[PDB]
Design a protein around this nucleic acid. Sequence first.
RNA 1: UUUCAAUGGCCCGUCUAACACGGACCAAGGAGUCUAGCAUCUAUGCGAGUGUUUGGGUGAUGAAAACCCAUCCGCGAAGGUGGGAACGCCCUUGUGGCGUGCACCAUCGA
RNA 2: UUGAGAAGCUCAGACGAGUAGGCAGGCGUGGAGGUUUGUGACGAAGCCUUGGGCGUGAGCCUGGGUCGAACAGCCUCUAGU
Lengths: 136, 209, 123, 50, 39, 125, 52
Amino acid sequence: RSKPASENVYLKLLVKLYRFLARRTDSRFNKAILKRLFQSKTNRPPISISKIAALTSRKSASSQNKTTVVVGTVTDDERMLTVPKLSIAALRFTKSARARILKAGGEVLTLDQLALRAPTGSNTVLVRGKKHAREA
Amino acid sequence: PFIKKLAANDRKTRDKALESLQRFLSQKKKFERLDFLKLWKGLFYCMWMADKPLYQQKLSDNLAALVPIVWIDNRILFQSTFWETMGREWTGIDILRTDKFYLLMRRFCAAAFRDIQTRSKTALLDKVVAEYNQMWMDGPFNTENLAFPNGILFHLADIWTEELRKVYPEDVPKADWYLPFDSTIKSSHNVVLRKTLPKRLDRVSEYTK
Amino acid sequence: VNIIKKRTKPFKRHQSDRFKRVGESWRKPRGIDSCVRRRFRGTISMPKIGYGNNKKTRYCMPNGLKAFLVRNVSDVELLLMHNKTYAAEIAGNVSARKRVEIVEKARALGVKVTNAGAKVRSQ
Amino acid sequence: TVREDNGKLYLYMKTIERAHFPSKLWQRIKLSKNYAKALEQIDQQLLYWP
Amino acid sequence: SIFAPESLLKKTKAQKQSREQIVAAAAEKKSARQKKREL
Amino acid sequence: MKFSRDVTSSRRKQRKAHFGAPSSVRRVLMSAPLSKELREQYKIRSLPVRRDDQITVIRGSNKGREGKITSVYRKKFLLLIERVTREKANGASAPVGIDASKVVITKLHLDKDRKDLIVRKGGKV
Amino acid sequence: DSVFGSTTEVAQLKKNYFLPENIISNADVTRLINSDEIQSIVKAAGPSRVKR
RNA sequence: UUUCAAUGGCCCGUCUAACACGGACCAAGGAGUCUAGCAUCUAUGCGAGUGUUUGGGUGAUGAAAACCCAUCCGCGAAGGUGGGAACGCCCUUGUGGCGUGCACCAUCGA
RNA sequence: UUGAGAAGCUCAGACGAGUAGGCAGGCGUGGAGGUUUGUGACGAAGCCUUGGGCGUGAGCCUGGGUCGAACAGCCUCUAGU
């Protein structure tokens, strides 16, 4: 895969940014952020606001100042009642996720604002979503 | 009633409203931060809309010398609201316009160093730098607000010692001139902002302690 | 760079010389019975990518300037900075008056008009 | 850009800060007849441009 | 007095590090490649 | 544009109702503009063409030839004026069809009918 | 502002309309690459079109 | 271009070596199209939701367009142990150590 | 040193038959929206040509003759292509 299958000309821009950041730096983060923007919509599955709040805040709850980063859509979970002070950076946020983070929490970022906050992608988590539909 | 004229589309109207702000701001009262955050959304656009390179580099000085017009109590409030409003919307610029919002930052960082020189003749500078340092500890160099971008502080390190020397040609005395940059590289969670900040800074340890 | 052609004789569809229903534009044969498809020696050749010409001296007239259809008086104006790599070919349906004004201006831009002489008898 | 207008060559320049004003978008400088003067007048107007 | 676009100020500083850090490995290469030509 | 659903804009319907109009419609389609000296004393932009009018020809190859209308030929949509006659080979003369839209009327053949049309349609005598 | 509303506020002349947002926060991608956030960390550059 | 010289050049398509079968020639016509259903892949919009167009409202400038939408309805609806993406701190520069370990896969929980 | 249509530019190697089949980029025809301050009675389309030009090719551009009212390039949509 060498060019996104889409025609979203606000996503030729991101690829024009992270395929510059892939080759002028030594991070395999940018060679993993770029290696996901090419993937089709069924290959970038959604991930909820509860699985993100569960991934960072568990075991020792190491959630100090790391920005969760998913190249997908940050959807919502409403069975989660209280939302922790999180910070995410995805392409799309659903309008019930972006209003359930800001209501008590931190920052919602596009991968633009990520590249001006962690240009080499340090102090981050690079999560995915579950690809498993269990039959489809 | 005043700000929405500062964002006019006519330089014969924008500037005509700027000199009357000199009357409006030298008042002897108390101003609340948001009132200086709404006024600083006009002088952003008073400088965002700036055509010529021989006007915007004159407009910056007219904005720089606006600080000594502020009353003594809220003079440090007025710069704190600027560094917030020059760090809240620094990503919205493009390269054809950052070149002119760097010099506004260069002047205001230098305009701070000028006012410490003015305030140093009233009371000892050791407390004046500290409360100025306090303004640096809740504006840019605060750690907990990760949203303050790097491009501000990288340019804030390069102009820190050079426009300390510019306002103090004879000799700048010892104070906590670099204490913002030491508490920043020590615990701030922007990894590059603690790694490459010393590589940009030109700190002078001969006179500081 | 001197212009060159890998071939000069165009390709000519098989048996388009005998029959008048079959036109001369090339059509690749589709049968494996064919002598031509299996590429028997003595039969005619075929268009392949081998006969592709130089990627820099392509589209060039034998002089060296590429062509450009100028169909009005503001289509030759773009050729102001490109007078040593383009020749202003006038389009065919342009009237014999609008033609005589492209020539008098392309001549100021030093641009070669290839067929300036049409419909224009000089005195 | 540089484009003639009735015998005398002009220089047209634009900026971001006049982009939303299509009437006043392009300013103008008239270039002198002396060819070495015109090159020295393009540079002094187009300084620090790429 | 037009000053400068201070973006170009910080390219002339990063090109005092680009020049120095490779012009240093020019004498240290030319002095190095006189050892191996003999060796 | 037209804003009525009871007028037709198709070339098919309009070009059929023209060429196959009856000989009462074929009268008001053959009208002539009045001269500038009559346009101000009758206050009428145009009159339908009668026989024995007093016209001048503005367009065509028969430019400026004045006359009177001999036979208003409603079928082939053309007037026939006096003494403007293309020759024939045999020796006889042929009449030249001048379109009724080209002529300019200089003196009406005023009658009781026309006056009762003139006095109501915007003007007087 | 009542037909389309805003990005976080409902358009008043439309039930359940919120204006969309962007996959890129700054609408201009060749002016982050040249910022001070990126060109401080990047590795030493190579040349342009290389010599033969 | 016409022709000459030298050298080569089994008539095309359908078939199953030759055949056979089609071919007098020229022109214009002439053959995987529309619709419903299902599935895959991709694109977009929204996202625990999603779908305006049966209708209603509206639309003076093709008013069968565009635009807005009530009440139903359809489809859907938190265990350790090993790896392992990435990212910190390292000091054997690296190597290696050290910590957090996504998807997916094993392992024992239910 | 300007070669940033980053869908561009540039450097170096290997490779090149191809059946059923699979994939990709393009050429052309009739209509539709947008565009060319588009071409046209000083001659549009067509047609003919022992004229010239381009493309590997489907094709296109053009000179001469003929002729007499319409027609095309570009980006999309559409098919009785």
